[PDB]
Design a protein around this ligand. Structure first.
Ligand SMILES: [K+]
Ligand SMILES: [K+]
Ligand SMILES: [K+]
Ligand SMILES: [K+]
Ligand SMILES: [K+]
Ligand SMILES: [Mg+2]
Ligand SMILES: [Mg+2]
Ligand SMILES: [Mg+2]
Ligand SMILES: [Mg+2]
Ligand SMILES: [Mg+2]
Ligand SMILES: [Mg+2]
Ligand SMILES: [Mg+2]
Ligand SMILES: [Mg+2]
Ligand SMILES: [Mg+2]
Ligand SMILES: [Mg+2]
Ligand SMILES: [Mg+2]
Ligand SMILES: [Mg+2]
Ligand SMILES: [Mg+2]
Ligand SMILES: [Mg+2]
Ligand SMILES: [Mg+2]
Ligand SMILES: [Mg+2]
Ligand SMILES: [Mg+2]
Ligand SMILES: [Mg+2]
Ligand code: NA
Ligand code: NA
Ligand code: NA
Lengths: 114, 34, 121, 57, 123, 204
RNA sequence: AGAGAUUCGCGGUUAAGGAACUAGGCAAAAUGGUCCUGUAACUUCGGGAGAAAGGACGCCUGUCAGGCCGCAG
RNA sequence: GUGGUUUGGCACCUGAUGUCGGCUCGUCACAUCCUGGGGCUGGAGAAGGUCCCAAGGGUUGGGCUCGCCCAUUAAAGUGGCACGCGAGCUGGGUUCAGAACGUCGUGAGACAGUUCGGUCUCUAUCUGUUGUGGGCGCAGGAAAUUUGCGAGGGUCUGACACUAGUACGGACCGUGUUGGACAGACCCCUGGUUUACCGGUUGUACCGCCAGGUGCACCGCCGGGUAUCCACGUCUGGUAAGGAUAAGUGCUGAAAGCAUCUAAGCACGAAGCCGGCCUCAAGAUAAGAUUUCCAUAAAGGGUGGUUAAAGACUAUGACCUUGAUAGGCUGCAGGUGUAUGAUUGGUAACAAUUAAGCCGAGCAGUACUAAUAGCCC
């Protein structure tokens, strides 16, 4: 009789997604309201952090846009995520890749798993 | 402009004089007030 | 989270390169400005042969923040820099190009002409 | 910093009202027939709750 | 405030506290009963029961994990020898603390902590 | 009118329009009427409600007789509520469906206890001077506590160090997200005073 | 010996901003090694000068190159 | 005429009443800066100007040291409180010994002057204030739930949109939407801490050695980090005016056949007053009310034990064996990030497979350990 679990199960939102961890390159398709239209925006980048409990987790994705680094935090239960696709699987040695912030060009590459 | 001022005369409860009571109401809602 | 004496990149094709925040507009003791907020700036460095002069007091709208911004749908966005766009007295863009991405919050800040941006995130 | 006046005997004794030695919490242990502190090992026999806890030769 | 902070610092720096707990654990393993202060015994219990549980896996890995805490080879040998066979199939609660009295020099509350399976009289 | 509750914890859910709502879960639980207070006898109208099931081991003889008169099983927590629409008798049972038509509720609780706190945490004092520039030992001091010989006293109500928290607090106008009768659950938007497991009063 | 309130002493970390503090950048932070490049005004021709500004640095293999690991040598 | 807030007059208090600005913390007045309500206008509207009532709440950050300037804001009010506040801070200025310049003096030295440097002591007795207990009282003893005599807190405000570019450039009134500041609570989110914990790595020492560990070097350094505690985070609040009024607006109406808001009566009319909202609150000795129980084991308690999201000590809460109170144990959420060994590869440094391993302040289950009804009212 865990009331928090009951509440989470009744209010469960979102969809199942393919497994991924920090260091993987993923594309997130996000629904956006541009006034009155329904658009899908694609955001591709590296997962640098996952944190939280169970289905209430949040993941941070980092990308480079016009030479300006961008980070986006998504709730993995968010109903605005329409699809997640894992492009490349990474090989890292730690859970949080905060060191990627101070790196650019060939210095910020991540080794592939296979 | 559906709002409207509504003032109604009513006898006083402590003196006994026809005092006024005012409120704003919708245009269609004036029937319930008066 | 931009306050007085914070230095910002100028993200348009006007002459200014860097700007210093003089004041955050909007009320007494209003400390911080975020994306879509209007600030007063002093221009700190310009390109050679720049239309705007060094030391010119101007208005600007913040378009990128290093500190993360929360959206009502539970998402957050943060950038690697702090960037603003200069405005004239009428409240319009002083330049003609925008460099780098801008926050999606600028759509509702009555600042639709920043749709010159390469990408709205 | 400094007492403006010396305290009277009355004032000193009134403050000392709450200075008291504490009585120990003593149980009887009716078998051995002598005092010991409640929730401790009976130091004479070495028993505790009717079981030999400490054996003395 | 110390809301939900669940270990006693025992008036020591962290390294001193860890060294003292290690020494106490070796002493308790070597001599099956020791006399201490009540607060030190209560801290030692939480420290020392996981170490005794680790002997339920008779492996080189578990021996090395236990040695990382003990750093005493005599205590390690006794622990993975006799103590393990004695506390086998006991589901926790290997130790017992009983209060005895007070010291003369500082009125400290004193007790003894012992391994339960080595007190035949208390079973 | 209202009911007694127990704070379970916080979570965050998604609404129908896609808004991340912080949420407090409360077990409102079956409350039994244990005494009806009337104008004729008590001088005011109220209902006494009991919340958490107790045992005879933890019920004293006076309270045991009180519950025996009410003809209910003994309860742990008792509280009084007024202005109840509809008549209720001795031993009636009220559940979380009592809030099934409320948009907003009031929650009374006991806040977390901080113990003795200084002026900086308790009252937001700015501290004396800076960390450097000649500071000796007044970084968290109160400063002056009065004026010179003219008042020649510290005024009543001067803000000083002392006990902070562990007191009764009311949070107004918390939106109700969902009533869950099958588990006696109430979901409110926002936070309520106290730690998990504390007893709350929930007023409609 | 306990306990781990306030407050002080000596230390550690800190989002975003970066002297806005203050009489005053006081204190703290920062700089820091070896080798190799490269060093302005001025000068009493000795200096200024370690000016300033850059690059390399771990381990293994082979006669400086090839490889290996880490956020960081 | 009033004030005592300027320059003065007097010399009544003073074996020390010891110091200008700034900081911190306030408190009061109203001679009102903003917000609220009105009269007059040389008030078309819109801006204003002057006067009246009104002290509830607000009343910025900088470059310079009363004042000037920069950028704001609804606004950046004036005064009292030993020109509030140094047993609360500071030490820039001022009072001191060093030194220099200008000027005066034969000189020692001096100054309507300037310049660089120059020890801020005290363990809080009484009262005061903020918190927290013990005793007794309240008709004999108690467990709960309470009424409210009273006290304290709270009280701010912007920009938009429609009405309507209409009434007369540009409205009053009316309605709706989002901000700033402040306060309370809270930790799901974001962010911080996290000398619990996990990993990487330099030097050195020890276990012949190796492997694997461990001590010390700021926690050696470095990268992360649960609970807790937090703000940079999140929720919630401040409205309106129920009653009586202020300045003012009026009805009817004499003294005074007219007039007149008043003398008899009666409507109105402010962020101001009393309430409403929140917290405390029967030592409110005027010690209140209701329900229930009433002496000894566990009617009520105390001492004691296991402890806590409760706490300086206390007090408060839970549990004390027909017991889940704390620990352990068995599982999970979760932190770290792939151990030890064995193979397979590589000449090697190393890589890959295998189970990761370690921890788990949180959650659930479970009497293994500890919680003896002993002693005293
Ligand atoms: K006085
Ligand atoms: K930083
Ligand atoms: K300055
Ligand atoms: K948390
Ligand atoms: K944490
Ligand atoms: Mg005493
Ligand atoms: Mg200490
Ligand atoms: Mg507490
Ligand atoms: Mg400070
Ligand atoms: Mg000093
Ligand atoms: Mg100091
Ligand atoms: Mg910082
Ligand atoms: Mg300043
Ligand atoms: Mg210095
Ligand atoms: Mg005379
Ligand atoms: Mg004297
Ligand atoms: Mg003064
Ligand atoms: Mg002083
Ligand atoms: Mg003083
Ligand atoms: Mg001299
Ligand atoms: Mg000097
Ligand atoms: Mg150390
Ligand atoms: Mg040494
Ligand atoms: Na001369
Ligand atoms: Na009685
Ligand atoms: Na646990």
């Amino acid at each position: 009789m865990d009331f928090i679990k009951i509440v989470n199960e009744e209010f469960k939102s979102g969809k199942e997604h393919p497994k991924f961890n920090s260091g993987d390159t993923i594309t997130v398709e996000y629904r956006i309201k541009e006034g009155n239209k329904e658009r899908i925006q694609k955001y591709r980048g590296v997962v640098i952090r996952i944190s939280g409990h169970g289905d209430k987790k949040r993941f941070t994705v980092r990308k480079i846009s016009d030479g300006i680094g961008v980070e986006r935090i998504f709730p993995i239960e968010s109903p605005f995520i329409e699809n997640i696709t894992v492009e490349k699987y990474g090989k890292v040695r730690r859970a949080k890749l905060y060191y990627l912030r101070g790196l650019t060009g060939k210095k910020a590459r991540i080794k592939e798993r296979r | 402009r559906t709002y409207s001022k509504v003032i109604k005369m009513v006898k006083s409860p402590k003196t006994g004089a026809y005092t006024f009571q005012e409120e704003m109401v919708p245009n269609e809602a004036v029937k319930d007030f008066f | 989270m931009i306050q007085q004496e914070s230095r910002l990149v100028v993200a348009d094709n006007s002459g200014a390169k860097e700007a210093l925040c003089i004041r955050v507009l909007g009320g007494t003791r209003r400390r911080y400005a975020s994306v879509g907020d209007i600030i007063v700036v002093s221009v700190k460095s310009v390109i050679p042969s720049s239309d705007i002069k060094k030391g010119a007091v101007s208005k600007a709208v913040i378009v990128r923040t290093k500190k993360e911004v929360r959206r009502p749908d539970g998402s957050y966005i943060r950038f690697d820099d702090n960037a603003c766009v200069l405005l004239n007295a009428a409240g319009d863009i002083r330049g003609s190009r925008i460099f780098g991405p801008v926050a999606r919050e600028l759509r509702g800040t009555n600042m639709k002409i920043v749709s010159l941006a390469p990408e709205v995130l | 910093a400094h007492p403006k006046r010396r305290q009277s005997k009355t004032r000193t004794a009134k403050r000392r009202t709450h200075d008291k030695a504490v009585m120990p919490t003593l149980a009887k242990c009716p078998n051995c027939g002598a005092w010991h502190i409640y929730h401790t090992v009976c130091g004479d026999c070495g028993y505790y709750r009717g079981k030999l806890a400490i054996e003395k030769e | 405030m110390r809301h939900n902070k669940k270990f006693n610092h025992l008036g020591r720096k962290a390294a001193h506290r860890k060294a003292m707990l290690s020494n106490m654990a070796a002493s308790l393993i070597l001599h099956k009963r020791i006399f201490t202060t009540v607060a030190k015994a209560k801290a030692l219990r939480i420290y020392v029961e996981p170490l005794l549980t680790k002997t339920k896996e008779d492996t080189t890995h578990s021996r090395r994990i236990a040695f990382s805490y003990l750093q005493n080879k005599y205590a390690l040998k006794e622990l993975f020898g006799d103590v393990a066979a004695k506390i086998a199939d006991r589901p926790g609660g290997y130790t017992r603390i009983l209060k005895t009295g007070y010291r003369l020099g500082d009125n400290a509350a004193m007790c003894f902590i012992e391994l339960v399976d080595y007190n035949e009289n208390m079973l | 009118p209202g009911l007694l509750g127990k704070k379970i914890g916080m979570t965050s859910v998604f609404s129908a329009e896609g808004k991340n709502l912080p949420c407090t879960v409360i077990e409102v639980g079956p409350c039994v009427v244990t005494q009806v207070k009337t104008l004729e006898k008590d001088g005011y109208s109220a209902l006494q409600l009991g919340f958490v099931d107790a045992k005879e081991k933890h019920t004293t003889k006076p309270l045991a007789g009180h519950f025996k008169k009410a003809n209910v099983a003994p309860k742990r927590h008792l509280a009084e509520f007024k202005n109840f629409e509809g008549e209720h008798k001795l031993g009636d049972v009220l559940n979380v469906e009592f809030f099934s038509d409320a948009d907003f509720v009031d929650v009374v609780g006991t806040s977390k206890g901080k113990g003795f706190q200084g002026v900086v945490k308790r009252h937001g004092f700015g501290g004396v001077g800076q960390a450097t520039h000649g500071q000796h030992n007044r970084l968290r001091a109160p400063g002056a506590v009065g004026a010179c010989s003219y008042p020649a006293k510290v005024f009543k109500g001067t803000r000083m160090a002392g006990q902070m928290g562990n007191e009764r607090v009311t949070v107004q106008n918390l939106e109700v997200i969902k009533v869950m009768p099958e588990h006696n659950l109430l979901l409110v938007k926002g936070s309520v005073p106290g730690a998990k497991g504390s007893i709350l009063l929930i007023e409609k």
